[PDB]
Symmetry: D2
Amino acid sequence: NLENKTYVIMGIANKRSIAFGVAKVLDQLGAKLVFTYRKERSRKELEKLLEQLNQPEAHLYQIDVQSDEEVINGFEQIGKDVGNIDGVYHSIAFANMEDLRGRFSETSREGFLLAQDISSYSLTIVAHEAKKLMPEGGSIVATTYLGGEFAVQNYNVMGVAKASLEANVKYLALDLGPDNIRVNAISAGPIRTLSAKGVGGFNTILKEIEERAPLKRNVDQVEVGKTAAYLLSDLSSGVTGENIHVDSGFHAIK
Amino acid sequence: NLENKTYVIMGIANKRSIAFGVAKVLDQLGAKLVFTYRKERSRKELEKLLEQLNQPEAHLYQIDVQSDEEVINGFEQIGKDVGNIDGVYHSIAFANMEDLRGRFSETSREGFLLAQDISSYSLTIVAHEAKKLMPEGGSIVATTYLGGEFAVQNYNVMGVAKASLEANVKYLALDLGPDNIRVNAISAGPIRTLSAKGVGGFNTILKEIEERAPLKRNVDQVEVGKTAAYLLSDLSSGVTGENIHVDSGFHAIK
Amino acid sequence: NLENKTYVIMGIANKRSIAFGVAKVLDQLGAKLVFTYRKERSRKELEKLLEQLNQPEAHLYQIDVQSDEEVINGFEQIGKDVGNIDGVYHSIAFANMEDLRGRFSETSREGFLLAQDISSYSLTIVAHEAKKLMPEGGSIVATTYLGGEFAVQNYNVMGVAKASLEANVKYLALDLGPDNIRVNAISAGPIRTLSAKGVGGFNTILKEIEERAPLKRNVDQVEVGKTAAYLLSDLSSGVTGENIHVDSGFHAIK
Amino acid sequence: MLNLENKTYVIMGIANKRSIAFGVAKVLDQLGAKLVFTYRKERSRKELEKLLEQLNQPEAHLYQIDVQSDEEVINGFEQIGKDVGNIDGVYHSIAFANMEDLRGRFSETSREGFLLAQDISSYSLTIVAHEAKKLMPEGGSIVATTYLGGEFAVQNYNVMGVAKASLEANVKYLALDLGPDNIRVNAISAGPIRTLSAKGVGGFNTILKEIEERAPLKRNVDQVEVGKTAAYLLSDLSSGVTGENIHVDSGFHAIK
Ligand SMILES: NC(=O)c1ccc[n+]([C@@H]2O[C@H](COP(=O)([O-])OP(=O)(O)OC[C@H]3O[C@@H](n4cnc5c(N)ncnc54)[C@H](OP(=O)(O)O)[C@@H]3O)[C@@H](O)[C@H]2O)c1
Ligand SMILES: NC(=O)c1ccc[n+]([C@@H]2O[C@H](COP(=O)([O-])OP(=O)(O)OC[C@H]3O[C@@H](n4cnc5c(N)ncnc54)[C@H](OP(=O)(O)O)[C@@H]3O)[C@@H](O)[C@H]2O)c1
Ligand SMILES: NC(=O)c1ccc[n+]([C@@H]2O[C@H](COP(=O)([O-])OP(=O)(O)OC[C@H]3O[C@@H](n4cnc5c(N)ncnc54)[C@H](OP(=O)(O)O)[C@@H]3O)[C@@H](O)[C@H]2O)c1
Ligand SMILES: NC(=O)c1ccc[n+]([C@@H]2O[C@H](COP(=O)([O-])OP(=O)(O)OC[C@H]3O[C@@H](n4cnc5c(N)ncnc54)[C@H](OP(=O)(O)O)[C@@H]3O)[C@@H](O)[C@H]2O)c1
Ligand SMILES: Oc1cc(Cl)ccc1Oc1ccc(Cl)cc1Cl
Ligand SMILES: Oc1cc(Cl)ccc1Oc1ccc(Cl)cc1Cl
Ligand SMILES: Oc1cc(Cl)ccc1Oc1ccc(Cl)cc1Cl
Ligand SMILES: Oc1cc(Cl)ccc1Oc1ccc(Cl)cc1Cl
């Protein structure tokens, strides 16, 4: 399947991060990987995590997506360091924790814009710069949640950033299609991760999946990873602009 | 139908503005109205336009939705001036002209955020402040475009702002529902307005409607205005979180 | 609003029928009406119900939509009897009760086809014959349920029939658009009616609305009736091919 | 990882070498699966035997099944059981309507045209699933083929559009019902491809070009491209995925 393919994975914080599910799958399929992190506070973290994978050597780059400069210099560095790439997995979002609770109508302007900034626009420059490393096409995948298509009870501002992300995926598919670059999203069902703790009611969400979703069980990081392997490889060559729900069928019921 | 109801209408620039179609319809149905504008450069403009309507007196307020302060002071002023209101029609959007062309992947961070700011978040504070003037419920309506649900060819950043606006409507419906405030959107088809001139290829868009759309003709401001009257009145009491296409059936075909 | 307009209303069984909410609304707006029923077992029923409305005289026609002949002769008779019409409200569906429970995978071929036949195809001949009584355009509205967009837990075959109904509305809107005939659907939220008793778990459905729906309450026949008045009148002239949820916003949350 | 040895799938609706189900067949066959083929007519039986020389099945597995007949679907799948043991998936690639319903005013379509289309293109999935379930003790995966015309009114698809809308719901309702038995039900919304049935759909040429001109990838897809997504849907790569409708259509479904 995937020898000699190269992918940049963005947004591993620890062993439970969705991007680490993706990482493990692609690593198993023999790909080489490039990891980006926000903070040093998870850098030495990552080095430990990497002992678990079989990279011939480490590729770790600090990228805070709030900074145009870091994304540009980051991707230029990846260029000089590994050569051309075949894909990017975007696993990045954020919002202020007090926005992710209380009345959505109460959310501040800066809260709103901050969420859009990190969870949605980041995909955009990321794509633009990644494009530079993809002469003969490639594949970009971002992670969303159902809360981007429907109002969910504690997701508020992040819901609005997901709706924004989803459209961003469509508009980038259209724009980067002629360069043979496919842009897709995976709408994951709830998984227990570090960021999951910011979302209120997350426990009762977890249980509604088990009770009402068709498969009657929750998904996990490895499951999201296997769909990312599909989206990033040539198995999905006909596929762009799409939003694939890895959520035990929850999106289909009501 | 609508005597003694009061509605704020936001975003009339001239006689061709969509919000002026809404204005005319509600004015005919005997409502009293409150108008908000961005610039003095369209204030004396508005006074002329109002001569066409039958308001017993003028209610005009400068509100730039980029400024928290102006929205708050604006709606407090309305409170003191007219008393409680029954609805708000939001007809506001903006993006940088050079973002509305060229590759979407080339758009700047500030372009992106500016568009989200005005076209999407503004609904949020608007709602929050309007809620203060709506003790026993009411109805809020914003205007969107199909470009929010699908990638269209020159809409780019505004597309991503519309996707965001539509989710904003959903999240606001959920939050304000218990206070008996309904939040809905109208996805208008292309209409020749002042802002329409920013959107590239607008002519061929206009014709695709005439050619491919079920009704085989374009809509107009008054036709948007008539649905607005429905969304804002008790006729739609069961209806919230909804997106009603006033677009000659274009949304339904492919 | 609606003096001298004429509409055919199809599928009143008793005072709790959705079509009777529509009836009451349009009758109040001063329209004249034409009623169609399946069984004599609800004919004298209807005569009683009509005492509640202010029709200058009775217009009652037996139409079983399973029979091509009855729909044709029915609508020809209406023509000779009242002249040309302005709309049709379709409120008809049926499936075998043992299909509306048990595994959906167990449903019989005849069960499936019967449900499609009455709940979906009926709209088609109805439109075709109606069109004959609509020289200068008009408006057709059918009734659907969310179960047509998502798998709901006891709806089974009727869900597949609604998905079918929804697409039939779209394809008719496209076909009858040039003759200025608008085709639309209303996706009602659960209401306690005679047919409602066939759908299992209906009670817990009713309560999920009150609990999780934005408006935090159930809708009723008169509420559906007021949206029908909008779809059928010139207020919705720009509107066709559309599905308007009258369901307290339940369709927008998840 | 590696992939699909010793998996067994029933492929339904190969008419000739251009049939979509033959793209699926070629992909799965390449991934080392064993296959079972079902056909409507003898008129395409000896057809199939020829096509199979192209694949590497250790032996032939061919079963006549007309989905209009409850009996043939039941006896067909019981025969598959006795013949090859338990299966892992089913690829459904079957639809039909009367040719004169695929043109003209949709409003003019006959009752029987309507019901016939539902019957073959939609309901068939249901009994197929019901019977297939009997050969899937520890779960499996069912995939059916649709078209965008199921979601939006397209200009010549008429009655088939209403059958696809019905097909898509059927997948959702089956996912819900068969989920607890570990059986996933999904669809692939293919973009236009030149096949035998394609010739019944009017305007098919200008459809083909709108894809090349307006679709993000600016080119048409093919059977092998549909086949590779089917491989994903049928394998454990998609374990988290049911009730879903995956567009293999160069991104056309996302633009407007
Ligand atoms: N967990 C779920 O059930 C779930 C469900 C649906 C969608 N998702 C999506 O999956 C993605 C990641 O979620 P997760 O569960 O993997 O959570 P996670 O383990 O907390 O990963 C979040 C990552 O975001 C990074 N990050 C946040 N802001 C950043 C910025 N400005 N620049 C660079 N990196 C930044 C974090 O680094 P730091 O730790 O240093 O902040 C962390 O690596 C997000 O897009 C999220 O919305 C998760
Ligand atoms: N025209 C179409 O075919 C079409 C189609 C779909 C949706 N829409 C939507 O319709 C709405 C209105 O557009 P229109 O076509 O009627 O154009 P328009 O006549 O130019 O009206 C747009 C209004 O938005 C205002 N605006 C921009 N920034 C503002 C701010 N910061 N504060 C207050 N007002 C601000 C403009 O004010 P100033 O000019 O005074 O600065 C103007 O009054 C928008 O939401 C647009 O997305 C239009
Ligand atoms: N009740 C709800 O909560 C709900 C929610 C969403 C959507 N809906 C929809 O709203 C519509 C109206 O249903 P309802 O709730 O008002 O039920 P209802 O009061 O019992 O009305 C159903 C009507 O359909 C008629 N019908 C069934 N098969 C027919 C046939 N072959 N020919 C002519 N008429 C036939 C019945 O006729 P006779 O009884 O006179 O024989 C009856 O008048 C239905 O399409 C239903 O799917 C209902
Ligand atoms: N081609 C496209 O661009 C396109 C696009 C979207 C969706 N699709 C879908 O693709 C699927 C497959 O058709 P195709 O276009 O690939 O070419 P095809 O092989 O010509 O498809 C027709 C298949 O249907 C089978 N069939 C019809 N009725 C049957 C019955 N009652 N019992 C058993 N088999 C029956 C036919 O078998 P016999 O003819 O041998 O009897 C034939 O093999 C269809 O479901 C279609 O809706 C195609
Ligand atoms: O998108 C998500 C959806 C779910 Cl159900 C759970 C976690 C998610 O991820 C986040 C949620 C909130 C914040 Cl502030 C940051 C992140 Cl990464
Ligand atoms: O959203 C729109 C969609 C269309 Cl088809 C036509 C006009 C539109 O309205 C705008 C477009 C661009 C900017 Cl900057 C501002 C506005 Cl109000
Ligand atoms: O569509 C419906 C949805 C709901 Cl919640 C309740 C009733 C409905 O309508 C019916 C459902 C099944 C049958 Cl046999 C007949 C009818 Cl009239
Ligand atoms: O549905 C389709 C859509 C397209 Cl664009 C091309 C082929 C299709 O397939 C069919 C269409 C009509 C009939 Cl009667 C039978 C089949 Cl197999």
